[PDB]
Every structure is written in C-alpha cells, then in structure tokens.
C-alpha cells in the first residue's frame, strides 16, 4: 500500500489474479494447514478487508469490499 502523495491520505496497491490457488484447511493453527490439491479461482468471490484502529469516534471497526472472478 503506497500513499498517492506526501500528505494525500490515499493508499493504492495492485496485483494480478492467478489461475490456481491453495485453500487453507484450518486457520486456528500457526502456521496454517494447507489442503493437498490446487483449485481454480474461477467462480469464487474476491474480498478485501481493512481494519480501522480509529473510526470517527476512535473505536475499532472492520470494513470491506467484494467482487466476482469470472471465466468465459
């Protein structure tokens, strides 16, 4: 995440969607336990989650956005 200006307050990042990915079986262990087979990303939703340590009142809240990966 890179701030657009010196004091703009807007952060931008980017990356490229892969054809395959490896699912996490159990998130309650460190390190995570991974599945044994790759899966296509097509037909799965993609989401980003941001955690604001300080909202308009100075309290912790989490916000997000979603989108769909498609194929032809």
């Amino acid at each position: 995440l890179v701030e657009t200006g010196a004091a703009t307050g807007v952060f931008v990042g980017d990356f490229q969607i892969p054809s395959f990915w490896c699912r996490v079986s159990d998130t309650t262990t460190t390190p995570y336990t991974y599945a044994g087979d790759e899966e296509t990303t097509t037909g799965l939703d993609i989401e980003v989650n941001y955690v604001d340590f300080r909202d308009a009142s100075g309290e912790i809240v989490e916000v997000g956005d979603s989108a769909g990966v498609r194929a032809n």
Binding site: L1, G9, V10, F11, V12, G13, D14, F15, Q16, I17, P18, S19, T41, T42, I46, V48, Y50, D52, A67, G68, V69, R70, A71, N72
Partner: peptide, 14 residues
C-alpha cells in the same frame, strides 16, 4: 468483476 490475469487495484481512503 475480474477475469483471470486481470490487474486488481485496491485503494484505502483513511
């Protein structure tokens, strides 16, 4: 909507 090998751009306005 995205497709395979599409650039996805994330912005945070805080």
């Amino acid at each position: 909507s995205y497709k395979i090998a599409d650039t996805v751009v994330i912005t945070v306005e805080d």
